[PDB]
From a paper:
The ER-localized Hsp70 chaperone [name] plays an important role in protein-folding homeostasis. Like Hsp70s in other compartments, [name] does so by the reversible binding and release of unfolded client proteins, a tightly regulated process that depends on the concentration of active [name] and on the nucleotide bound to it. [name]’s SAP domain engages [name] in the ADP-bound state and disfavors nucleotide exchange, thus acting as an NEI to modulate [name]’s activity. Our studies suggest that [name] contributes to protein-folding homeostasis in the ER by antagonizing nucleotide exchange on [name], thus stabilizing certain [name]–client interactions.
To better understand the details of the interaction between [name] and [name], we co-crystallized [name]’s [name] in complex with the isolated SAP domain or with [name]. Charge complementarity between surface residues appears to play an important role in stabilizing the [name]–[name] complex. MANFE153 hydrogen bonds with BiPN200 and BiPT203, and MANFK138 bonds with BiPN239, contacts observed in both the [name]–SAP and the [name]–[name] structures. MANFR133 undergoes different interactions in the two structures, forming interchain bonds with BiPE217 and BiPD238 in the [name]–SAP crystal, and intrachain bonds with MANFD119 and MANFE136 in the [name]–[name] complex. MANFR23 is observed to engage BiPD355 and BiPD357 in a potentially stabilizing network of hydrogen bonds. Contacts between the SAPLIP domain and the [name] (observed crystallographically) do not measurably contribute to the affinity of the binary interaction with [name] in solution, suggesting that they may be dispensable. Therefore, whilst contacts between SAPLIP, SAP, and the [name] trap the otherwise flexible SAPLIP-SAP interdomain linker in a particular conformation, in solution the SAPLIP domain may disengage from SAP and the [name], as suggested by the NMR studies. [name] contacts the opposite surface of the [name]; the cleft between subdomains Ia and IIa.
Residue numbers in the entry: 27 to 406
Amino acid sequence: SGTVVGIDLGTTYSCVGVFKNGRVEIIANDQGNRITPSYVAFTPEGERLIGDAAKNQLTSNPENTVFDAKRLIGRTWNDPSVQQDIKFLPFKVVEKKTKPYIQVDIGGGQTKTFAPEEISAMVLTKMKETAEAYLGKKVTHAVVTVPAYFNDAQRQATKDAGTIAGLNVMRIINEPTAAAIAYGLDKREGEKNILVFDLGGGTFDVSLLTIDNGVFEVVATNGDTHLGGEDFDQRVMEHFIKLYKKKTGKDVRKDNRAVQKLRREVEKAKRALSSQHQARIEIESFFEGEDFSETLTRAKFEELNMDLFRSTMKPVQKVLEDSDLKKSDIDEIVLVGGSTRIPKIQQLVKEFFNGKEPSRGINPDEAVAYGAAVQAGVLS
């Protein structure tokens, strides 16, 4: 096994960690980032790009930048989920052997068709190489996380992706369970009920876990597969674009370059508003050599997204019903994903459970990788 690594193979972002000196170390990639976009792309030239480099050229290559391969991985063509998601994806997806395949251009007008597994394998290879650089030796084995709702086919496909990347995926472990392990909830005594609330960039997952004698079980799952941090950005985008036209008289929509410059500052401001109450957004030479200068308040950000924020509670109530539990039967609450940093999200969860405090202490972007790395630590 050697040094086995824990890998959160996320829909939008992936994360890699290892256990050493009786603690978890989340490994930074060669650009110094602890998370790595699950992105693959090809340039006008032959060059293949994985991670940050792939996501940064998304704007200039909108139709041949692959992402969200995890939505397709291990599914059939006829699957209702696949047919829904291909309408939201810019790149072309096609049937081959009654399964979804991703068709992209390499360079010089040459096309190529990859299986979801191959895309995920490329991302895994990048996480593998990231880990190898930190450890200073080859990595052969890994613990990979998947959503709780994944079936056998999806679990096996994730293993296959590993195999292609040269990784022996020792264990497949459910994302909420990994998050629970990160917070040391497996050290708790007796029988307890655990609510995991996972709000990523483009996905929302609620899971009710039990723990019994330091061993978990996923009782019920729910959420929204197309609700995440990006939807909160889009409401902010829509607000400020409308404001710009109202003040200047200029419609910015058809200028792709300027719109990306705004999305960059909106994303920065959103993160800032998790700890501050206002954030200036200044862009010099924004559109037709005219500047942009507005402020986003926490109150406004909340106002623009209030309906979306409240909609997260319905899945929480539904999983409790399917688990045959009341609010008061929940002993632990675990918040995972960057969007859970938002104060309003935390308050809504807190208030739903009549003032009970969620667990804190772990980077919610990293919690799942953390847990996987602990399991890897055991198997090293």
